C-alpha cells in the first residue's frame, strides 16, 4: 500500500551529528525552508505525524495538520541523546551502522523500536503520509532490503511491504571540488 515517509527538516544535532532520538529539538532555519519545500509536492492524502516539536512542524510547514502519535517517534537513545558520533563507544557505532541487535543504554531497544514502528503501519488502511524520523524511514527501508539512508526534509514513497516507488529530495547537498 502507497505510504509516504517523511524525515523531518535539519536540526542542529543532524548538522553537528549527534545522534537525536527523545530530545525535543526545533528545526533549523534551513530545516524550516526543507519542509515549506514539500507543501504542494505530497499528496493530499490522510496525514499522521510523530509528536515531537520537529515532526510536528513539518507536517505544519508541508501543509498538513496531522494527528499526533508517539508511535511515530524517533528511537529513544537515553543515555546516548546528544551523544557525539565521534566518541561513541565503538560497539554503538557498529550497532546503528548495521541497524541490528542495539540497545541504547538507557533508552528503547531497536527490537522495541521497530515493533511500535511496523505495528503502527499495519494499522493503516488507506494511503498516508506519515511525518517521521530518520531512524523510522531507515527501519520501514531496510525490511524492504534498502539501506535506509535519507537525507533530511525527504520523502520517500512506498508500496508497504513490497518496494520503493518515489523518492523527494533524495539526493544530498550538492558537492564541489
Known amino acids: 500500500?502507497?505510504?509516504?515517509?517523511?524525515?523531518?527538516?535539519?536540526?542542529?544535532?543532524?548538522?553537528?551529528?549527534?545522534?537525536?532520538?527523545?530530545?525535543?529539538?526545533?528545526?533549523?532555519?534551513?530545516?524550516?525552508?526543507?519542509?515549506?519545500?514539500?507543501?504542494?509536492?505530497?499528496?493530499?492524502?490522510?496525514?499522521?505525524?510523530?509528536?515531537?516539536?520537529?515532526?510536528?512542524?513539518?507536517?505544519?510547514?508541508?501543509?498538513?495538520?496531522?494527528?499526533?502519535?508517539?508511535?511515530?517517534?524517533?528511537?529513544?537513545?537515553?543515555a546516548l541523546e546528544g551523544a557525539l558520533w565521534e566518541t561513541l563507544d565503538p560497539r554503538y557505532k557498529e550497532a546503528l551502522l548495521r541497524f541490528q541487535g542495539f540497545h541504547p543504554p538507557g533508552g528503547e531497544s531497536l527490537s522495541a523500536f521497530q515493533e511500535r514502528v511496523f505495528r503502527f503501519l499495519e494499522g493503516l488502511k488507506a494511503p498516508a503520509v506519515l511525518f517521521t524520523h530518520g531512524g523510522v524511514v531507515r527501519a520501514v527501508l531496510r525490511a524492504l532490503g534498502e539501506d535506509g539512508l535519507v537525507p533530511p526534509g525527504s520523502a520517500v514513497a512506498v508500496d508497504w511491504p513490497r518496494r520503493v516507488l518515489v523518492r523527494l529530495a533524495m539526493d544530498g547537498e550538492e558537492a564541489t571540488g
Open 1 to 78: 500500500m502507497e505510504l509516504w515517509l517523511v524525515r523531518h527538516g535539519e536540526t542542529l544535532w543532524n548538522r553537528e551529528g549527534r545522534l537525536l532520538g527523545w530530545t525535543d529539538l526545533p528545526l533549523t532555519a534551513e530545516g524550516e525552508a526543507q519542509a515549506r519545500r514539500l507543501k504542494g509536492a505530497l499528496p493530499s492524502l490522510p496525514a499522521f505525524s510523530s509528536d515531537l516539536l520537529r515532526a510536528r512542524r513539518t507536517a505544519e510547514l508541508a501543509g498538513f495538520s496531522p494527528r499526533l502519535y508517539p508511535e511515530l517517534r524517533e528511537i529513544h537513545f537515553g
